[PDB]
mmCIF file of C-alpha atoms and ligand atoms in Angstrom:
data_model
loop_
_atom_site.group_PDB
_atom_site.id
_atom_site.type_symbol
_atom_site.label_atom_id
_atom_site.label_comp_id
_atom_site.label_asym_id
_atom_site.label_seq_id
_atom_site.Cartn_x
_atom_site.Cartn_y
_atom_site.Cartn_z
ATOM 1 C CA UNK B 183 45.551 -75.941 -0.560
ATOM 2 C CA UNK B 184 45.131 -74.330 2.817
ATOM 3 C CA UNK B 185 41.997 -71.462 3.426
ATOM 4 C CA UNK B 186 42.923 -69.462 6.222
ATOM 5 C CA UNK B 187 40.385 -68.172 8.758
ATOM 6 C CA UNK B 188 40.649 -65.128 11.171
ATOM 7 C CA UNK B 189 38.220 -63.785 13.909
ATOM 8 C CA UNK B 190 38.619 -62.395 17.332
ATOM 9 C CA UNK B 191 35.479 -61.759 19.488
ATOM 10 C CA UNK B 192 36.748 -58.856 20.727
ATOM 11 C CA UNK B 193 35.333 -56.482 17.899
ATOM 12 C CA UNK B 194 32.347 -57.953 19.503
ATOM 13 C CA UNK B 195 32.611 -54.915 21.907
ATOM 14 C CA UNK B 196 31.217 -52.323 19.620
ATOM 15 C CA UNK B 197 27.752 -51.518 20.346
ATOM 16 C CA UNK B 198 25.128 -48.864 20.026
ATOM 17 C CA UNK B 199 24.173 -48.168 23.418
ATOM 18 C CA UNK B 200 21.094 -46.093 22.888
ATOM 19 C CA UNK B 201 19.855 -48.910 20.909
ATOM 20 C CA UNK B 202 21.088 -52.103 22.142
ATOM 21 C CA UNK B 203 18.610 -53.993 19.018
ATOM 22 C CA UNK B 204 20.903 -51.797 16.291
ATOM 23 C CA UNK B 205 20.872 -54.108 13.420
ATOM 24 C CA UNK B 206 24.857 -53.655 12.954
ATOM 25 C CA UNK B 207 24.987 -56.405 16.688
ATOM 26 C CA UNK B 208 28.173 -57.638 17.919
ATOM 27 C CA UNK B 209 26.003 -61.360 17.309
ATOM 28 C CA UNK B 210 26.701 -60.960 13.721
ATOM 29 C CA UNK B 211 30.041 -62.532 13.658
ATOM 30 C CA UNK B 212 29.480 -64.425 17.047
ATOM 31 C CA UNK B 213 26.624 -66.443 15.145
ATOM 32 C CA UNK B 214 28.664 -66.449 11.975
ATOM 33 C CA UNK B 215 31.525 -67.905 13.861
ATOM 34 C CA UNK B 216 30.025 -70.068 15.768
ATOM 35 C CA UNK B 217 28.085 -71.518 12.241
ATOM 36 C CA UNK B 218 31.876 -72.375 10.981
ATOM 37 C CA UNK B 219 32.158 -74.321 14.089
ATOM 38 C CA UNK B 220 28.600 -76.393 13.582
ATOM 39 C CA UNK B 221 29.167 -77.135 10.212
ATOM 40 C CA UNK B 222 32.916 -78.220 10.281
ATOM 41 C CA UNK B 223 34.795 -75.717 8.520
ATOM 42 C CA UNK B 224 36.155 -74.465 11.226
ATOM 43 C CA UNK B 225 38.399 -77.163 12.203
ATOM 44 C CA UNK B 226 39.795 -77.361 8.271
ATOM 45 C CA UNK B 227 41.069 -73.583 7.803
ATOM 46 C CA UNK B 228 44.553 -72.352 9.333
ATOM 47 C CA UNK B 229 43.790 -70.071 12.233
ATOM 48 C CA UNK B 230 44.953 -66.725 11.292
ATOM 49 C CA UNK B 231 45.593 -64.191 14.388
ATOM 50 C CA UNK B 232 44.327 -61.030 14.606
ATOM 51 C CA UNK B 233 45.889 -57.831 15.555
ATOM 52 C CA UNK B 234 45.504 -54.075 15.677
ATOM 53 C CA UNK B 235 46.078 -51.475 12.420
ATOM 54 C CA UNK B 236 48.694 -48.867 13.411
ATOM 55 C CA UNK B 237 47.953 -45.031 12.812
ATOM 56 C CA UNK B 238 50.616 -45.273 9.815
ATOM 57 C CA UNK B 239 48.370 -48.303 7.993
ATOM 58 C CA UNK B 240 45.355 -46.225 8.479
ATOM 59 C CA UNK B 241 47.144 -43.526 6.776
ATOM 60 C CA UNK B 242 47.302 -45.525 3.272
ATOM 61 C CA UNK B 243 43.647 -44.703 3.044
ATOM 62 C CA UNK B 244 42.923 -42.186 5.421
ATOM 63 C CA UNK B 245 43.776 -38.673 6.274
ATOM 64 C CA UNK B 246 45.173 -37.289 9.965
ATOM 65 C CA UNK B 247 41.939 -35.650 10.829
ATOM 66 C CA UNK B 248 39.651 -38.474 10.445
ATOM 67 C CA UNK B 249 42.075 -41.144 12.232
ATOM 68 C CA UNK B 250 42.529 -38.213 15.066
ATOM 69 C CA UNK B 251 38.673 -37.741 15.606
ATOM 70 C CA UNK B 252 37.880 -41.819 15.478
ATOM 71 C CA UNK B 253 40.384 -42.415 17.811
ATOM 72 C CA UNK B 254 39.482 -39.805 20.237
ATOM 73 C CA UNK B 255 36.254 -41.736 20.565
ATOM 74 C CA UNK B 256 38.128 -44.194 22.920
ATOM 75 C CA UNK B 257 37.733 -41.970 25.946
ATOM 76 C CA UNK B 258 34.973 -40.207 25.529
ATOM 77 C CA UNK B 259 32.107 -39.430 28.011
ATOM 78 C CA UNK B 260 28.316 -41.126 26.410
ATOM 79 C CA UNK B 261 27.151 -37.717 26.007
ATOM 80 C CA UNK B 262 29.963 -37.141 23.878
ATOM 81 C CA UNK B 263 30.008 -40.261 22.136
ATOM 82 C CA UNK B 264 26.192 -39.590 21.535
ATOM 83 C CA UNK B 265 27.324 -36.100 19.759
ATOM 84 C CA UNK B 266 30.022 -37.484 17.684
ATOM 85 C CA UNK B 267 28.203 -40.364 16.154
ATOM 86 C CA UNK B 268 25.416 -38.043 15.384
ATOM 87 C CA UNK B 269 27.729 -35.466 13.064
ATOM 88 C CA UNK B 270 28.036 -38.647 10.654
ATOM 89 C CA UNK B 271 25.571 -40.384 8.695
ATOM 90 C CA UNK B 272 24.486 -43.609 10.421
ATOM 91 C CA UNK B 273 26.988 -43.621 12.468
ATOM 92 C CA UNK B 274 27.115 -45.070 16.726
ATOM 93 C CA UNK B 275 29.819 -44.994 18.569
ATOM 94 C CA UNK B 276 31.346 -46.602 21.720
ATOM 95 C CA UNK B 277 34.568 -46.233 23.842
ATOM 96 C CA UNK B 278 35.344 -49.776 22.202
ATOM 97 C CA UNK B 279 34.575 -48.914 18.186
ATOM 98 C CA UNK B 280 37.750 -47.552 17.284
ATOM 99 C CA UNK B 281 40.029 -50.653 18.629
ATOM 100 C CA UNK B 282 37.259 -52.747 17.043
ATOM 101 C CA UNK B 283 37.242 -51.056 13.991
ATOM 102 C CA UNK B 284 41.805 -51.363 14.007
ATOM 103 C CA UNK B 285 41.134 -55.129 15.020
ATOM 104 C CA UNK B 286 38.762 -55.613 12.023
ATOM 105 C CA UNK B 287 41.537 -54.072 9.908
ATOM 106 C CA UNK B 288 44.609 -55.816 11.484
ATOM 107 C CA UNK B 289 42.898 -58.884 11.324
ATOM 108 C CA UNK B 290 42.527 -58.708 6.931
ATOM 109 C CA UNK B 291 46.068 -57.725 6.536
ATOM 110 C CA UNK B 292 47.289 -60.263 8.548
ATOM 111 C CA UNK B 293 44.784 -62.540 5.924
ATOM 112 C CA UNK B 294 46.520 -60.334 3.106
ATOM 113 C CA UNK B 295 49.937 -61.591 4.213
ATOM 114 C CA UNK B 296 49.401 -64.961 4.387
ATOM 115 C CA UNK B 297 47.830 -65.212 0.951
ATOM 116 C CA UNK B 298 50.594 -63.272 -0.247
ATOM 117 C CA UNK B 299 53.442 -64.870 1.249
ATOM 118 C CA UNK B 300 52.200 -68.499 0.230
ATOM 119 C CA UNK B 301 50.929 -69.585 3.869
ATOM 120 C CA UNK B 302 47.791 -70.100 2.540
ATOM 121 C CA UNK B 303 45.816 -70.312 -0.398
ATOM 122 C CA UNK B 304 42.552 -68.122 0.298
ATOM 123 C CA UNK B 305 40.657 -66.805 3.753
ATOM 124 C CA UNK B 306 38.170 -65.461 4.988
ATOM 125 C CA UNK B 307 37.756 -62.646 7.505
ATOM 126 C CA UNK B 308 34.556 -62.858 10.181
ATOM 127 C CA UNK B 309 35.508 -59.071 11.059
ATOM 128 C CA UNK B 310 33.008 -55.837 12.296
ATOM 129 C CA UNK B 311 32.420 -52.692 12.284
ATOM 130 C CA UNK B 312 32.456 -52.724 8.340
ATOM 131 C CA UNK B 313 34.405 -50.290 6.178
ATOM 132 C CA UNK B 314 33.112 -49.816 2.773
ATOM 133 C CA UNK B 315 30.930 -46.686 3.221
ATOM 134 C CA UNK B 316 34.024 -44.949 4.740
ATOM 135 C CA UNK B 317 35.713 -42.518 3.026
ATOM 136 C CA UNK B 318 39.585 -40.556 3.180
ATOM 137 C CA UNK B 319 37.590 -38.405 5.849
ATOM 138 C CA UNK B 320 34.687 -39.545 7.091
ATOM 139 C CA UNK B 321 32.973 -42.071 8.833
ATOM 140 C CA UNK B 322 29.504 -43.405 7.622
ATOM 141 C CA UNK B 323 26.769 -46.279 7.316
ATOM 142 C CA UNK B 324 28.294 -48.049 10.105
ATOM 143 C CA UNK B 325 31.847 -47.838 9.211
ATOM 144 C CA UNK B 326 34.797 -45.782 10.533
ATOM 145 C CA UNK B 327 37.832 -47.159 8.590
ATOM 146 C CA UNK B 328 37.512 -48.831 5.010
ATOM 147 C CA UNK B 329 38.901 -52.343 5.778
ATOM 148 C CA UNK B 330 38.773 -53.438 2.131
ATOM 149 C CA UNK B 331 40.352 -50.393 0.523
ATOM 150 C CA UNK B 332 43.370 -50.421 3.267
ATOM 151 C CA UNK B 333 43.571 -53.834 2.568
ATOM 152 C CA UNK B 334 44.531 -53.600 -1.361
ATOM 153 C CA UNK B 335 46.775 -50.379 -0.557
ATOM 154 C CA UNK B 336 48.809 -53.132 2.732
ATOM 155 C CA UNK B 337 48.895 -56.015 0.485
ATOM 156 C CA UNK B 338 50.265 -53.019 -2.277
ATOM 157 C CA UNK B 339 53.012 -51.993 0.665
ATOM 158 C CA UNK B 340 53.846 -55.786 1.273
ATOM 159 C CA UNK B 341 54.475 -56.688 -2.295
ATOM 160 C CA UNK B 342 54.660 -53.788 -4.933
ATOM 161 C CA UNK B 343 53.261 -50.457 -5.797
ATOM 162 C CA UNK B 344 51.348 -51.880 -8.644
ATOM 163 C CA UNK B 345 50.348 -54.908 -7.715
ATOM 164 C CA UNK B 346 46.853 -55.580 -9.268
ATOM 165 C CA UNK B 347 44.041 -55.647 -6.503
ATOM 166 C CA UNK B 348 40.373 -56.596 -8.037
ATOM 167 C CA UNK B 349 37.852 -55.225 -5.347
ATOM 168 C CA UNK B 350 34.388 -56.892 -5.930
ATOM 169 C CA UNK B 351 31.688 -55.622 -3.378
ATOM 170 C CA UNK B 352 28.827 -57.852 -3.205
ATOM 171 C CA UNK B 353 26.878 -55.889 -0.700
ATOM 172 C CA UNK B 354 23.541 -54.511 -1.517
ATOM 173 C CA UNK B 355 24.829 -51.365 -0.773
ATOM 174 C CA UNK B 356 27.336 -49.183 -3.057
ATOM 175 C CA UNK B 357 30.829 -48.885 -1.377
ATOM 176 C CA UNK B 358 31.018 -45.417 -1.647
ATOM 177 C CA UNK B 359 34.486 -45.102 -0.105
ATOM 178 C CA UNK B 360 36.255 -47.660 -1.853
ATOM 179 C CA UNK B 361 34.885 -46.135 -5.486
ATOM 180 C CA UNK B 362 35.981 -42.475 -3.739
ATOM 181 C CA UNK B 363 39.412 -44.059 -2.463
ATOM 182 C CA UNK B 364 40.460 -45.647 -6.014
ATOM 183 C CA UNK B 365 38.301 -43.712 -8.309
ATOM 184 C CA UNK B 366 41.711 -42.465 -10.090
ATOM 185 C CA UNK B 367 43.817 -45.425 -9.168
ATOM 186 C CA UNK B 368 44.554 -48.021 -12.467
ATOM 187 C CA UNK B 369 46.224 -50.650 -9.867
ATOM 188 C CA UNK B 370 42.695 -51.947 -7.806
ATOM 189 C CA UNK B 371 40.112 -52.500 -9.917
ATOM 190 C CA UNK B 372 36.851 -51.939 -7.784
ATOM 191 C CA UNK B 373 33.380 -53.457 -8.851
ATOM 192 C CA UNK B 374 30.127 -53.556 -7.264
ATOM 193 C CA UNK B 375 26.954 -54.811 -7.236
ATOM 194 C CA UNK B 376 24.565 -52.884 -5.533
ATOM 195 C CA UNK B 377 20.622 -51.658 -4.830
ATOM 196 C CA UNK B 378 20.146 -48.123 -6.628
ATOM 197 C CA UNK B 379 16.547 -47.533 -7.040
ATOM 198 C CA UNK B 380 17.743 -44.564 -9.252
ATOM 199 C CA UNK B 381 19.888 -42.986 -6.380
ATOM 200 C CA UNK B 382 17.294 -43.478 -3.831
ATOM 201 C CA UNK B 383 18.692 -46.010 -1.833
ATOM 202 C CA UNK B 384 21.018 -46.045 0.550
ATOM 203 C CA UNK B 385 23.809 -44.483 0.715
ATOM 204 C CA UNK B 386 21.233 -42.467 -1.799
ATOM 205 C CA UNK B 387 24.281 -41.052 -4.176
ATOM 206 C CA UNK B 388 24.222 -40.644 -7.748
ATOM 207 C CA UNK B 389 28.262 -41.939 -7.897
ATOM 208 C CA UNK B 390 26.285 -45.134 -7.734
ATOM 209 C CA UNK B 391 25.519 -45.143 -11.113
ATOM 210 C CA UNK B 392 26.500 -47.147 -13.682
ATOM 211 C CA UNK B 393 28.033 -44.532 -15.973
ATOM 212 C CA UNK B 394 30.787 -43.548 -12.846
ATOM 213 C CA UNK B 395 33.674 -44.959 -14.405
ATOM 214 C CA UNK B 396 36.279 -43.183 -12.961
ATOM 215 C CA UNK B 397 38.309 -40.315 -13.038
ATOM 216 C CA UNK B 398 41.588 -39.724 -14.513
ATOM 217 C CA UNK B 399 44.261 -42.665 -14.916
ATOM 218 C CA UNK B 400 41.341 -44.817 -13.377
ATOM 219 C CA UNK B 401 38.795 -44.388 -16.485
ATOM 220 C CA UNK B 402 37.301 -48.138 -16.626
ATOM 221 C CA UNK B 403 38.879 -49.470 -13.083
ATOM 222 C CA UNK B 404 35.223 -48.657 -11.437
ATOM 223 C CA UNK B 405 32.460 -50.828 -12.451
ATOM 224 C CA UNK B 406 29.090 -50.169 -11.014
ATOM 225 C CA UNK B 407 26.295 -52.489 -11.661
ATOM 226 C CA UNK B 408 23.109 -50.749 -10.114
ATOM 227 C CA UNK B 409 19.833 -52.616 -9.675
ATOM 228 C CA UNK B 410 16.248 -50.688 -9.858
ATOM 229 C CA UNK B 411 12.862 -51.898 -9.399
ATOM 230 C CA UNK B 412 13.194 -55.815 -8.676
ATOM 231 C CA UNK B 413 13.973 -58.018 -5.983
ATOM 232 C CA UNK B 414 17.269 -58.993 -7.542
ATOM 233 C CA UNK B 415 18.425 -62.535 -6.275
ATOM 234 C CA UNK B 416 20.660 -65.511 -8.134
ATOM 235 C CA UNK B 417 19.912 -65.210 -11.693
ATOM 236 C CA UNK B 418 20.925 -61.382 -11.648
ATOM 237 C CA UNK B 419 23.908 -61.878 -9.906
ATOM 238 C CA UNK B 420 24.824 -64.986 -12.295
ATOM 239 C CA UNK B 421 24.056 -63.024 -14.731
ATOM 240 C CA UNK B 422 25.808 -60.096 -13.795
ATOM 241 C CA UNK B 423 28.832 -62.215 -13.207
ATOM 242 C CA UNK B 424 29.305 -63.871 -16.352
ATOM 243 C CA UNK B 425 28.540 -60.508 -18.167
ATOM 244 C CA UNK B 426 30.483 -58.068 -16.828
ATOM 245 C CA UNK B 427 32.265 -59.268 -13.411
ATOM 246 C CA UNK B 428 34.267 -62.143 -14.611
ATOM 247 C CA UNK B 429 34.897 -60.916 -18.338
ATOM 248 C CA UNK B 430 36.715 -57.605 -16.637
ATOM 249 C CA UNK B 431 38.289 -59.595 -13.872
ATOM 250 C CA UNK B 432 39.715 -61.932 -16.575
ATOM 251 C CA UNK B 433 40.961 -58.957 -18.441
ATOM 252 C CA UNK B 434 42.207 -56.859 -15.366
ATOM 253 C CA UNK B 435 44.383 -59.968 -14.443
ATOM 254 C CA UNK B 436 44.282 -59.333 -10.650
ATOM 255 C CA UNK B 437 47.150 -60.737 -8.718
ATOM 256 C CA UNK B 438 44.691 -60.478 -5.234
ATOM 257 C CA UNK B 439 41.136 -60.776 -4.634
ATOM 258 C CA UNK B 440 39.405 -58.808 -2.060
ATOM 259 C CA UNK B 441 35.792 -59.451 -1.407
ATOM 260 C CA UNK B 442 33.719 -56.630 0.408
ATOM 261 C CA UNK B 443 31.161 -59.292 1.259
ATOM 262 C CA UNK B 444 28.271 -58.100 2.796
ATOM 263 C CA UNK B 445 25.465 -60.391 3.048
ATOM 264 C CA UNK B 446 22.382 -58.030 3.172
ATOM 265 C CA UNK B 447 21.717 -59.204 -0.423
ATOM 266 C CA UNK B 448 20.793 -62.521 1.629
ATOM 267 C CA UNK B 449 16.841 -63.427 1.260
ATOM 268 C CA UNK B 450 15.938 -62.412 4.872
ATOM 269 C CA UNK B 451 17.862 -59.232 5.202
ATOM 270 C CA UNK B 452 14.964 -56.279 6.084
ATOM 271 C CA UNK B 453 17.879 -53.989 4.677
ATOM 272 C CA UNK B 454 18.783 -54.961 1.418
ATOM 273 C CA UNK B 455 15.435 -56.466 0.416
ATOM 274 C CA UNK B 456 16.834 -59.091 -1.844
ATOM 275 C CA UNK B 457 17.010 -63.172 -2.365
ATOM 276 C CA UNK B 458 20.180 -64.572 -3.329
ATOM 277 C CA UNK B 459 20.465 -67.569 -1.470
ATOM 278 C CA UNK B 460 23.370 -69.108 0.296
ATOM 279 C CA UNK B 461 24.278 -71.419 -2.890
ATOM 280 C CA UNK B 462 23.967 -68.193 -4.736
ATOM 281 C CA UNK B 463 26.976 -67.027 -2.543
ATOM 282 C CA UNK B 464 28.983 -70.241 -3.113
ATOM 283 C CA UNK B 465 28.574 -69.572 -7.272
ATOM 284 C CA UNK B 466 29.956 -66.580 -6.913
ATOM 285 C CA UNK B 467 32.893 -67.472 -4.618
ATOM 286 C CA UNK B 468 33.473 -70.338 -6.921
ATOM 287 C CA UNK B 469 33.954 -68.100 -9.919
ATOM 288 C CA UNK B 470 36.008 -65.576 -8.225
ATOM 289 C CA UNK B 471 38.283 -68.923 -7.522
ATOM 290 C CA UNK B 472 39.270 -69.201 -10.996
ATOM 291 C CA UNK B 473 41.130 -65.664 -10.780
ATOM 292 C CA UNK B 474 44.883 -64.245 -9.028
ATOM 293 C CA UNK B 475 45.523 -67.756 -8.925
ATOM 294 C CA UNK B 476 43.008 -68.173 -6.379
ATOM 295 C CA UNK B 477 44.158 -65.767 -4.351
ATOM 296 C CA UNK B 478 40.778 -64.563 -2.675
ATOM 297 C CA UNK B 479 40.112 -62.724 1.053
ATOM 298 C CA UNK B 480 36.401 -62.784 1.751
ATOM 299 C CA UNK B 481 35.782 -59.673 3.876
ATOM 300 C CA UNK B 482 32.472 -59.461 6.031
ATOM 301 C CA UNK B 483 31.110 -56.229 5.738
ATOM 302 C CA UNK B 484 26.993 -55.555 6.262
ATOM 303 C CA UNK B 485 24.245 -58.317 6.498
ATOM 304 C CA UNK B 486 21.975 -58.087 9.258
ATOM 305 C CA UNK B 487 19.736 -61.195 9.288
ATOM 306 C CA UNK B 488 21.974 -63.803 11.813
ATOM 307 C CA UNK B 489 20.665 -66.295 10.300
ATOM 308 C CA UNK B 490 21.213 -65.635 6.644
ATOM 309 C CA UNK B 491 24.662 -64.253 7.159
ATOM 310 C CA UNK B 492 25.746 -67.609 8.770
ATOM 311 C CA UNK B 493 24.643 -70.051 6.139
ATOM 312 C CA UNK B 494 25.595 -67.151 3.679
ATOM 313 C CA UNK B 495 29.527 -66.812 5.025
ATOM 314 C CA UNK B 496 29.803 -70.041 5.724
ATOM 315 C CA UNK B 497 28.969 -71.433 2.114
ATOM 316 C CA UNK B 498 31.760 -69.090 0.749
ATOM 317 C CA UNK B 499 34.314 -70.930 3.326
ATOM 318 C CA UNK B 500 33.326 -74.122 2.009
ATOM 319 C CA UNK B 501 33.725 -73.127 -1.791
ATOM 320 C CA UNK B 502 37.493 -71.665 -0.726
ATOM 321 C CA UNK B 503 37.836 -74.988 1.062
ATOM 322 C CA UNK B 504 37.390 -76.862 -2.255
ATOM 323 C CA UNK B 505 33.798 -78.399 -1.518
ATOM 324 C CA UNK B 506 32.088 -78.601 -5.007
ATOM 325 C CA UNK B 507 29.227 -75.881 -5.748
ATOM 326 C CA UNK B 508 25.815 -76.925 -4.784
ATOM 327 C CA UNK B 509 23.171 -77.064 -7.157
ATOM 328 C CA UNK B 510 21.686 -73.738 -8.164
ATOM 329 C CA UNK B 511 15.402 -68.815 -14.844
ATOM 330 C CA UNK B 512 15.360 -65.950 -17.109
ATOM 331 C CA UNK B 513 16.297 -62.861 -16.010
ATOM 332 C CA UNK B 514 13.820 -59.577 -15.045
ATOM 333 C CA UNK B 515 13.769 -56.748 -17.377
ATOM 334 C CA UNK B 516 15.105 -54.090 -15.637
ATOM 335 C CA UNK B 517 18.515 -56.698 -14.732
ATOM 336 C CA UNK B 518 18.758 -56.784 -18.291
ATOM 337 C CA UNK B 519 18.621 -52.822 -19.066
ATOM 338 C CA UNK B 520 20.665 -52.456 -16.082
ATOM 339 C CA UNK B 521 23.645 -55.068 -17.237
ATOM 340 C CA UNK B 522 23.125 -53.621 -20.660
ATOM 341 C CA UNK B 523 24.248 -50.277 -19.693
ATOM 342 C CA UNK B 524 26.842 -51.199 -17.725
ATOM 343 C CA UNK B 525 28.052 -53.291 -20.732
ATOM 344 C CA UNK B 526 27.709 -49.857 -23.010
ATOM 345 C CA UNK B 527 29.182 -47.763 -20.530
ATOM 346 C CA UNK B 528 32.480 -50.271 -20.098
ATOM 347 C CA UNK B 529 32.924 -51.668 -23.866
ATOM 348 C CA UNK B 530 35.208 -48.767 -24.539
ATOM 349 C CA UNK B 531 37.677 -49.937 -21.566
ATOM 350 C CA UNK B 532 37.355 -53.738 -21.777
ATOM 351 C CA UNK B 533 37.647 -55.226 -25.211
ATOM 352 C CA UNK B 534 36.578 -58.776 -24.006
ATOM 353 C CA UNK B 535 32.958 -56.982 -23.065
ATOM 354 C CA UNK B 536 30.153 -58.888 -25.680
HETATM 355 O O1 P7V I 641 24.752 -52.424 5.470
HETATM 356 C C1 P7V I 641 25.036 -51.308 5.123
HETATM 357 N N1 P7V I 641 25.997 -51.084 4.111
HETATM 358 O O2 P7V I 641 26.528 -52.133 3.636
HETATM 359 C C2 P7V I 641 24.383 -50.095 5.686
HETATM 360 C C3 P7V I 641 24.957 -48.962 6.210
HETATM 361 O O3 P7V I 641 23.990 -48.085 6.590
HETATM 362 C C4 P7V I 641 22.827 -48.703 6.262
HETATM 363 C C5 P7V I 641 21.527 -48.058 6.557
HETATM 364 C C6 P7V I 641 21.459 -47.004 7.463
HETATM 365 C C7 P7V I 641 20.228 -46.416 7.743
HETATM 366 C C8 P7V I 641 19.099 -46.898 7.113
HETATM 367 BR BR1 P7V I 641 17.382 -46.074 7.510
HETATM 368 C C9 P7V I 641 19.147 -47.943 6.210
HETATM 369 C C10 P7V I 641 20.377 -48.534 5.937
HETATM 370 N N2 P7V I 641 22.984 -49.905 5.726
HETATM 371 K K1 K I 642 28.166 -53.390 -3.372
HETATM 372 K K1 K I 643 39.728 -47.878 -9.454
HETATM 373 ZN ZN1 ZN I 644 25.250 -53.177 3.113
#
C-alpha cells in the first residue's frame, strides 16, 4: 500500500513579525520535513502536490465575513496587520498568512482525494498555520481557517453527503472549532483528547468538558476526553484509546480518518506540558490503522518543541508506511475519573462502551 506525503515550504512564509521567536515558527515543518528526509521515509511515500483552497471550499466551513476579513490581511500595511491580529485571541498576522493558511488547506484535500480515489492508501500532511481553534467566524490560537473540519466537509463534496468522517484531535489543546463546526452534524464524528485543568487551560472553555456531547441530530458524535491535574503521557492515552476512542470509532464505522495531530502533547513541549513519547504516537497511529479501511490523513496542527514534533510526525509516517510498532504502568487517578466520566456520559450513545 502506498502513504502519500504532501508539504510545500511556502506556508513557511507566515511569521509573527513583532516576535520573530513566536513558538508557532515557520521551522516547525521545515525541521519536520527535513526529519522525513534523515530518516528515510521520505523517499517511500507518493509526493502529493499542494495547492491553494478557493473562497467556495472555505465556504463549507466558513462564513463570508470571516473569509473577507482573513483575506484582506494580504495587503495590509504592519500597523494594520498589528491591529487585526490583536482583535482575535492569539492571533499574528502577516501579508503571507492567508495564502499560507489556503496552501495548508489545499494541500489536505488534495491528501483527501487521493485516499479517496484509491491513489493511495494513507498520508500525511506537514502543513501550518493550524486550524482547529478556528471557528465559522473567527480566527484564534494560531489558526485562521479549520483545515481538519474543511477537510471532512471536501472529502464529503468529493464522495457523498454522508459519508462518515471520524475526526480524532490528539492535540493537547481542545479543537474548539471543529466541536463548534460539527457539534449538530451525525456524519463526522469528532473526538478529542485534550488538557482541561477544569476549564482553565487553554483555549480556557467549559465546551471542553466531557459532558458536551452535542447538540441536536449530533447527540453522541462529540467525544471529549479532558485531562486535570497530571502530566498525562502514554498510559493515558492507551488507555483512553482502548476505552473510549477505538470502541466508538469501531461503532461509528468511519469511511475516512482525519487526524488533527498536534504534537504539543510531545514530552518537551513548554505548551502542553505533557510526555507521550514518539512510540506513544506510533500506538496510536497504529490503532487508528485498523479503521475506514485504513483510510487515515495525519494533519499537523500545534507542537512547538522542533525537536519533539520531528521524531513525533515522523513515527506516525512510519506506522502508515507499515513499519511494525516499537516497543512501548498503571494509570493516575484522575485519568481514571476522567475516562470514567466520559464512559458515563457516552454509554447512552454507544452500546459497545464497557
Ligand atoms: O497549540 C495550540 N493549539 O493547539 C495553541 C494555540 O494557542 C495556544 C496558546 C496561546 C497563548 C498561550 Br499564553 C498559550 C497557548 N496554544
Ligand atoms: K485535542
Ligand atoms: K459531531
Ligand atoms: Zn495545541
Amino acid at each position: 500500500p502506498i502513504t502519500g506525503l504532501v508539504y510545500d515550504q511556502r506556508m513557511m512564509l507566515h511569521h509573527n513579525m513583532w516576535d520573530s521567536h513566536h513558538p508557532e515558527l515557520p521551522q516547525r515543518i521545515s525541521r519536520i520535513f527535513s526529519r522525513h528526509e534523515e530518516l528515510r521515509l521520505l523517499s517511500r511515500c507518493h509526493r502529493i502536490p499542494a495547492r491553494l483552497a478557493t473562497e467556495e471550499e472555505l465556504a463549507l466551513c466558513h462564513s463570508s465575513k470571516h473569509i473577507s476579513i482573513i483575506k484582506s490581511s494580504e495587503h495590509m500595511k504592519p500597523r494594520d496587520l498589528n491591529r487585526l491580529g490583536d482583535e482575535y485571541n492569539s492571533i499574528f498576522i502577516s501579508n503571507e498568512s492567508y495564502t499560507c493558511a489556503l496552501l495548508a488547506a489545499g494541500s489536505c484535500f488534495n491528501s483527501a482525494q487521493a485516499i479517496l480515489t484509491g491513489q493511495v492508501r494513507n498520508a500525511v500532511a506537514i502543513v501550518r498555520p493550524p486550524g482547529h481553534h478556528a471557528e465559522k467566524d473567527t480566527a484564534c490560537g494560531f489558526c485562521f481557517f479549520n483545515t481538519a473540519a474543511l477537510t471532512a466537509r471536501y472529502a464529503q463534496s468529493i464522495t457523498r453527503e454522508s459519508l462518515r468522517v471520524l475526526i480524532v484531535d490528539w492535540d493537547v489543546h481542545h479543537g474548539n472549532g471543529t466541536q463548534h463546526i460539527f457539534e449538530e452534524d451525525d456524519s463526522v464524528l469528532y473526538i478529542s483528547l485534550h488538557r482541561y485543568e477544569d476549564g482553565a487551560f487553554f483555549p480556557n472553555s467549559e465546551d471542553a468538558n466531557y459532558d458536551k456531547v452535542g447538540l441536536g441530530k449530533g447527540r453522541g458524535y462529540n467525544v471529549n476526553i479532558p485531562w486535570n491535574g497530571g502530566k498525562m503521557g502514554d498510559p493515558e492515552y492507551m488507555a483512553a484509546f482502548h476505552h473510549l476512542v477505538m470502541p466508538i470509532a469501531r461503532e461509528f464505522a468511519p469511511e475516512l480518518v482525519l487526524v488533527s495531530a498536534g504534537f504539543d502533547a510531545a514530552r518537551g513541549d513548554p505548551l502542553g506540558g505533557f510526555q507521550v513519547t514518539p512510540e506513544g504516537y506510533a500506538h496510536l497511529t497504529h490503532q487508528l490503522m485498523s479503521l475506514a479501511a485504513g483510510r487515515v490523513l495525519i494533519i499537523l496542527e500545534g507542537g512547538y518543541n522542533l525537536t519533539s514534533i520531528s521524531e513525533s510526525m515522523s513515527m506516525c509516517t512510519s506506522m502508515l508506511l507499515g513499519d511494525s510498532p516499537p516497543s512501548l504502568t498503571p494509570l493516575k487517578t484522575s485519568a481514571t475519573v476522567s475516562i470514567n466520566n466520559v464512559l458515563r456520559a457516552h454509554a447512552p450513545f454507544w452500546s459497545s462502551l464497557r
